[PDB]
Design a protein around this ligand. Structure first.
Ligand SMILES: *[C@@H]1O[C@H](CO)[C@@H](O[C@@H]2O[C@H](CO)[C@@H](O[C@@H]3O[C@H](CO[C@H]4O[C@H](CO)[C@@H](O)[C@H](O)[C@@H]4O)[C@@H](O)[C@H](O[C@H]4O[C@H](CO)[C@@H](O)[C@H](O)[C@@H]4O)[C@@H]3O)[C@H](O)[C@H]2NC(C)=O)[C@H](O)[C@H]1NC(C)=O
Ligand SMILES: *[C@@H]1O[C@H](CO)[C@@H](O[C@@H]2O[C@H](CO)[C@@H](O[C@@H]3O[C@H](CO[C@H]4O[C@H](CO)[C@@H](O)[C@H](O)[C@@H]4O)[C@@H](O)[C@H](O[C@H]4O[C@H](CO)[C@@H](O)[C@H](O)[C@@H]4O)[C@@H]3O)[C@H](O)[C@H]2NC(C)=O)[C@H](O)[C@H]1NC(C)=O
Ligand SMILES: *[C@@H]1O[C@H](CO)[C@@H](O[C@@H]2O[C@H](CO)[C@@H](O)[C@H](O)[C@H]2NC(C)=O)[C@H](O)[C@H]1NC(C)=O
Ligand SMILES: *[C@@H]1O[C@H](CO)[C@@H](O)[C@H](O)[C@H]1NC(C)=O
Ligand SMILES: *[C@@H]1O[C@H](CO)[C@@H](O)[C@H](O)[C@H]1NC(C)=O
Ligand SMILES: *[C@@H]1O[C@H](CO)[C@@H](O)[C@H](O)[C@H]1NC(C)=O
Ligand SMILES: *[C@@H]1O[C@H](CO)[C@@H](O)[C@H](O)[C@H]1NC(C)=O
Ligand SMILES: *[C@@H]1O[C@H](CO)[C@@H](O)[C@H](O)[C@H]1NC(C)=O
Ligand SMILES: *[C@@H]1O[C@H](CO)[C@@H](O)[C@H](O)[C@H]1NC(C)=O
Ligand SMILES: *[C@@H]1O[C@H](CO)[C@@H](O)[C@H](O)[C@H]1NC(C)=O
Ligand SMILES: *[C@@H]1O[C@H](CO)[C@@H](O)[C@H](O)[C@H]1NC(C)=O
Ligand SMILES: *[C@@H]1O[C@H](CO)[C@@H](O)[C@H](O)[C@H]1NC(C)=O
Ligand SMILES: *[C@@H]1O[C@H](CO)[C@@H](O)[C@H](O)[C@H]1NC(C)=O
Ligand SMILES: *[C@@H]1O[C@H](CO)[C@@H](O)[C@H](O)[C@H]1NC(C)=O
Lengths: 142, 437, 435, 143, 439, 143
């Protein structure tokens, strides 16, 4: 389903990342498909100027969020993948925990809370590593 | 030997505000707006292992339902004829023809000078009015009650404001979660949470003291309130069984169409056929007795196991406050509920008044006129919950008193929306791994 | 051995026309500018950047103009119409300890208007200024009855200016000129980039520029074409000239029902003596200030030229007088006393008007509800709008007169240092590297 | 450091290409986040039909401009790169210089006048090259 | 061992419904609301070896054009003054001044009490009205719309003259054009091309006779949803145009009456000179030859020896029974019985009088009406008849003859007749195929 | 040749113009705004047409949404940045009981789409699964 086994542990959750990944845009396109189930009423809905504007805003925001996240993955060199290995080491201060409890017993919901104070730090670190890697690639190619 | 792995498609979420989409199923006001049907098979996901925290009193889905219903309501009034031209001195006398005692002085016969379709011509017409909407100037001359405050717009005669269960659907990127807890407290951690595409179908029923045509608390009578020790907070009482209430408007009415301008029509109440009798509601006495006994048994959990509990009648204020405001067939009934709350724990007939000029959603400056309904009205409704308020109590630690409360329309939606929450899905996150590029 | 490299994220901008968004720290501007500014704008100094500015072709001015008019109309959109007042008035003279001035300026008018009930009328009366009352062939018409609908501003609504910030949408940037003594056109060498402009108060005036930025270093005179007497000259001063304005009469109000919750706010009796409205300009300051302007003007005409100042020419009050909006009251101040000398405390009387055709449009008249008590205004004169006289050959003396009346110049004078560009991050260049 | 070093030599200016790429979408989302800081005011902008439409158009256009450029880089085989090289030689008559005469203390702002009207020619060439390389792989992978 | 290959950018399209936008050729309502310029050089791309199916009777481009026109129309009246102050009792007499017999009683002189700019004063004014707009009470008259609708004055500064309008596809869509000679509205078309926009179609609004449309190449073409079904219309596109000259000969003047604070009403003043009837001229020989061509085409479906008759129109109001002609901004209702008064047997200057009406229920929608202000001087219009709207009289089920009558009134057919060659499709770039290639 | 040039050409032949449709589908959006920019003084009039403005925004938004959904899907299948790609999913021969030569030649894409339209979702699901397994394998091999 849409969330799938949200309460499963992290290792199991990783099996359906694709299902979740595609839902933001397929849902939007389907919403248009749902409007088209009765094209004759659209003219009665467009009279409601405020409802019209709110729906446009909702779609625009969903697109903007999607793109921002995809760009961010591209910035870090993770574009095109659901799972991205990187060159940034994990800090024990973020979480002093083994790759046993983290993947087999904890869920993503629990994990998200545990390390919620480091998101902006990790992201900045990923950006710097990628910036260096690209320049190094150009010199090696040359 | 720990590396950062970035993942996309992680099943986590946050509490969030987003506008929900309204959907329906297979000239009604909500049928016109909520055009898109829901998925015929909106199968839920049981989020096994997941415990979520809820707060029904801060649920923003309620605020949206409030905003949306008012907006749609106003846009369904906006396009029709204004009744401004009728704010003239009325020449009124009593209707004394076939009147029972209960209706003496309530039904009035008023004549007035209104325009015709030509600007040079007037017509003298007459119609019937209910006492509640007519105010005496300084004994024959009367004014409509809203002439000193607001404009009155006639409701469109074809539009049916009949509640349709409607469903609210999440926008992509968001999800609706609902908790299947038979004993849900109203706040805090709740188990058996499932994820759905849309909410169940909730009818936009308008009422005050008694909540009609909703859910029935699974298996038990449930008392829920925000800050229960504070007598100023409304208590929503949900019943485990429905109580059927039968309401009527016994008079056989006629209507007349008066042209008031070019393509403009005014709907006036015509003569009444047969005897003039008072509108009323019938509640089974035994069912009602049993129901309150169950409610008290539960109320005592917060007030004391040997505490004496009294049900008193309503306080002062507007009819929307002091009576049960009942909307049926399109006419507005204001029913005396004191006969329902006149007992102490240790068939009932409620007389009703009819009003045509109303001020919904606790607002002033605008008013709706409800065209009359011809024939008679017979209503059948289900009482599914009650709204109570508690007395301050002074220094009384022996007994306690409750009165019918409510009147705040948001309370009529919390009663159905309490189990739902909307969250934002957040697909990105990281975790340590055993790989490096 | 150079090959093509495609670069993305290149720091290059081009001139562009986009829509900017208002930012703010029952006031109209304040309510409409919901977005809050960044408390600490991240201004970027741009090293080794020369850029060309042109204040006379700056589209930021047009947007400010458009937004102001649109918001103005929007705030009045839900307000009560005064159509019911367009009746014959029966007017007589007010005789209540009126001083030598205003002998014919204030009138006592009675009229027949409806009440809430459509079948009854009431007789009411109110005071009017002569500027808004027109004689028919005692019988008078409101001045705008033969042209347009008159609406009433909602009394709770405030038009008091708040410093409003214009901000670029993502993908755009605002470049600004920091050069001291910048001409208004051409290349600027001290430049920076901002996300938002400084806040500009949308001050309305017609001859003098009020509450704007004060020039740095010296008096600066800017024009589109200095030799063309068809152009306005914007003069920015480098020292403020304080002006004290008042409307001394103690007013009261009466609220009249004109319909079903529909109210008209009428001007009531004046309490106490009746005195004329006026503004005070320090004489010495004005003398010196004007002399500074002249020195700066001579730089464009010669060292042997006399500059004469004169008053305004004919036209509408919005042109011939200095319109001033204070407390929501509308003053029409006579500035001839400021432009009398020739470069070889000043009291300016002001009239009060209530029905205002604020813009250059004629179909929308608005009635300014009366204000109770008395008012006092204090403001900073920061500049002038001046024009040259007609053609001649005798260059010995030039005459300058108050110009203006076109409100776009009131914003042009603040926005002159800003330019909007778009960013185009993609481009190509050679390198010693190939696939 | 939005447009910092814009007046610097192109070779050095390249150190912040990453910032500029991020700025557009980050700015769009944060600007929306900023407006929504005060729903009490923001809700009244729903009455300004004209501002509703203008802001949506501005947001939509920024997105469209973004996607256009990303698609083009993808077509050229530069998806995910800020400084990609191709297999198309730098034609001498475009600049008629050596590399240090391009990076001779010349800025990107100045470089724009050197490219001038050669921009569309080069873009067409870049797509043509990728088309051939892609076809070659389609058959090389079938041996 | 073939493998799945995936492609993006595959040139495949499917039928689709989208919203097209308006574009205009390098104060006229049609132009002020169609700001996108057209391409001075549209590129029509021939599609070699493509057969596609078209169906003019199911073409949603027609529905959009109809909707857009109604919307545009309403937005053009919205800002101008309502004339409800004029719905007063009128004191009318007949105009009796050098009137030709044919116009007697068709023009009335009406005086009335109307308010002026002040709410406490009235004025006596008078104007002329056409008979069709005025109904007798029980000398006392009222306007015909006084009991059913509010009437809005058309804006005196707005032109309604048709401008060729081009419909253009949004990105992701394409418009396919059918180039087959003799394509008669349905089925496969083998000569096809892709365009960005349609050609410019003037939004001419009329009944019975179509004016200033596309002219057929080669033969006269008869198009109908069924042919056999007497409940359906027949659209006949001519291969040679017929010139028609229309006029309103009376020299008019106009007066402008102040009715409120910035509101003015435009009234018809006295006619200068003689009063004559409006009319249209059709060359007789041309009409007879043209009609004979139509008949030859009808026989293809109805038989040699099946007598063909052209009869008058049926009953109904003037939006049905007469030709509806909108020109100069004036509204003419022309009697076409003189064009359809013959029987054709196998193998073996016309003056049409017109009426003028100022209250127009233009879209067959009731509850709104437009008031057409008068035009000063005289007017003349020259236009091309490009097609006919005909119906079959179904009474003659088993007969030796069939009768055709003028029909129409459904405005969508006026556009269906121009858009019949265009179709909207959506591009779907993804697809898969087998390949010899694997990762 | 043109936007849909050679629509009737064979499937194989048609690969030569694959780039043209892929780019025009997105870039035509910005050109349409550039056509409105001819006369901003006319467009400002159109901004007052409340219904028209909403419809145009809906149209632009949908063009973007359609585009992005397809791009996301290509990314899901592991074909981001390519117009032509190969996978690890064999052809069934049940989808179409035909040989390679008779499909790439003597057949157009329009005909082909009709022939196999019933398997669209099946094929897409298989492609997603292949990529799902591949990414896990890559992480485990890097580990
Ligand atoms: C809680 O839930 C209950 C159950 O749904 C609601 O009660 C129903 O309310 C509806 C709407 O008022 C009632 O339906 C109406 O019945 C009228 C009476 O005629 C009936 O009986 C005759 C035979 O004598 C039949 O010929 C006829 O078809 C009906 O079955 C009708 O006159 C009404 O129709 C008219 O008004 C509607 C307005 O929508 C128009 O659409 C119609 O075209 C027509 O003009 C209508 O059918 C229904 O009977 C009630 N049920 C019961 C058991 O009483 C409660 O109202 C709801 N409570 C609250 C608070 O919301
Ligand atoms: C089928 O197609 C034909 C054209 O091919 C249409 O016929 C044309 O219809 C238009 C609109 O009715 C006619 O336009 C009018 O022409 C008048 C001609 O005046 C000439 O002489 C005066 C002498 O004083 C000159 O000043 C003038 O420039 C011309 O040389 C104009 O006077 C009219 O002006 C009015 O409207 C304008 C609007 O901008 C106002 O500003 C003016 O003040 C005034 O009110 C107007 O321009 C055109 O002449 C017709 N052509 C022919 C050959 O007759 C058919 O109408 C069309 N059929 C259908 C059903 O659509
Ligand atoms: C319902 O009606 C009864 C009428 O019997 C109301 O009770 C009356 O309240 C007034 C106000 O205090 C007293 O003066 C009367 O004496 C009461 N009636 C009796 C029995 O004498 C009651 O308040 C009404 N309740 C509602 C819900 O409207
Ligand atoms: C939930 O339970 C707590 C006691 O644990 C109580 O204080 C609170 O009032 C309850 N919530 C509701 C809505 O009754
Ligand atoms: C509600 O609960 C009481 C106590 O268990 C029970 O007697 C009553 O029947 C229930 N109501 C219903 C559903 O009948
Ligand atoms: C309500 O009406 C039903 C029939 O519709 C009847 O069986 C029931 O007893 C009535 N209830 C009361 C309280 O009168
Ligand atoms: C009334 O006022 C006018 C000025 O508008 C003045 O000329 C006239 O003399 C005054 N009349 C009286 C009696 O004061
Ligand atoms: C400064 O303004 C004058 C006009 O007053 C103009 O002639 C001159 O060229 C301007 N200087 C620059 C650098 O643009
Ligand atoms: C303003 O400029 C004048 C010369 O133009 C100078 O004499 C005066 O001191 C300046 N005032 C300031 C900035 O103090
Ligand atoms: C002050 O005014 C006098 C009279 O016009 C003039 O002669 C003198 O120069 C002025 N002084 C200055 C420069 O302020
Ligand atoms: C013409 O219409 C007939 C149906 O009346 C249909 O069978 C035929 O295929 C159509 N032909 C063309 C070329 O449109
Ligand atoms: C017209 O054709 C349709 C099929 O397109 C058919 O269903 C219908 O019965 C036909 N009508 C007549 C009158 O034969
Ligand atoms: C169309 O078919 C002919 C042979 O009948 C062939 O020569 C031509 O190349 C084909 N067209 C296309 C676009 O492939
Ligand atoms: C091919 O498709 C058929 C029909 O669904 C299916 O039964 C068969 O198993 C498929 N072959 C493969 C890929 O195993």
């Amino acid at each position: 389903g849409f969330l799938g086994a949200a309460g499963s542990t992290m290792g199991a959750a990783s099996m359906t990342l694709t299902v979740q990944a595609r839902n933001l845009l397929s849902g939007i396109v389907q919403q248009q498909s749902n409007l088209l189930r009765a094209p004759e009423c659209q003219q009665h809905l467009l009279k409601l100027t405020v409802w019209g504007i709110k729906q446009l805003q909702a779609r625009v925001l969903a697109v903007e969020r999607y793109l921002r996240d995809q760009q961010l993955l591209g910035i870090w060199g993770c574009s095109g993948k659901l799972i991205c290995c990187t060159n940034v080491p994990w800090n024990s201060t973020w979480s002093n925990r083994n790759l046993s409890e983290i993947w087999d017993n904890m869920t993503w919901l629990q994990w998200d809370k545990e390390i919620s104070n480091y998101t902006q730090i990790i992201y900045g670190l990923l950006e710097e590593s990628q910036n260096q890697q690209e320049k190094n690639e150009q010199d090696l190619l040359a | 030997n720990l590396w950062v792995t970035v993942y996309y498609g992680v099943p986590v979420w946050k509490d969030a505000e987003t506008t929900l989409f309204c959907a329906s199923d297979a000239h009604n006001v909500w049928a016109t707006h909520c055009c898109v049907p829901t998925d015929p098979n909106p199968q839920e996901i049981h989020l096994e292992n997941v415990t979520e925290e809820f707060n029904m009193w801060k649920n923003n889905m309620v605020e949206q339902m409030h905003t949306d219903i008012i907006s749609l309501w106003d846009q369904s009034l906006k396009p029709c004829v204004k009744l401004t031209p009728l704010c003239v001195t009325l020449q009124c006398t009593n209707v004394t023809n076939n009147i029972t005692d209960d209706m003496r002085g309530e039904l009035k016969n008023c004549s007035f000078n209104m325009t015709t379709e030509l600007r040079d011509k007037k017509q003298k017409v007459y119609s019937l009015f209910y006492r509640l909407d007519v105010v005496q100037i300084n004994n024959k001359e009367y004014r409509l009650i809203n002439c000193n405050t607001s404009a009155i717009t006639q409701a469109c005669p074809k539009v049916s404001f009949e509640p349709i269960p409607i469903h609210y659907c999440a926008p992509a990127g968001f999800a609706i979660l609902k908790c299947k807890d038979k004993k849900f407290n109203g706040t805090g951690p709740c188990t058996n949470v499932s994820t759905v595409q849309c909410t169940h179908g909730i009818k936009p029923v308008v009422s005050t003291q008694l909540l009609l045509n909703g859910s029935l608390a699974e298996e038990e009578v449930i008392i829920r309130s925000e800050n229960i020790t504070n007598n100023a907070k409304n208590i929503l009482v949900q019943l485990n069984e429905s109580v059927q209430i039968n309401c009527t408007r016994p008079n056989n009415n006629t209507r007349k169409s008066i042209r008031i301008g070019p393509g403009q029509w005014f709907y006036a109440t015509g003569d009444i056929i047969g005897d003039i009798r008072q509108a009323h509601c019938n509640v089974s006495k035994a069912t009602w007795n049993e129901t309150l006994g169950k409610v008290v048994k539960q109320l005592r959990k917060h007030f004391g196991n040997n505490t004496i509990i009294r049900f008193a009648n309503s306080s002062g204020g507007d009819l929307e406050v002091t009576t049960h405001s009942f909307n049926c067939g399109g006419e507005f009934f204001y029913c005396n509920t004191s006969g329902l709350f006149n007992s102490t724990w240790i068939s009932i007939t409620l007389p009703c008044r009819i009003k045509q000029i109303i001020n919904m959603w606790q607002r002033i400056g605008q008013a709706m006129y409800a065209p009359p309904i011809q024939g008679v009205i017979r209503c059948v409704s289900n009482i599914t919950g009650l709204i109570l308020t508690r007395d301050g109590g002074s220094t009384n630690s022996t007994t306690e008193t409750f009165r019918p409360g409510g009147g705040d329309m948001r309370d009529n939606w919390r009663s159905e929306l309490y189990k739902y929450k909307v969250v934002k899905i957040e697909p990105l996150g990281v975790a340590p791994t055993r790989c490096k590029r």
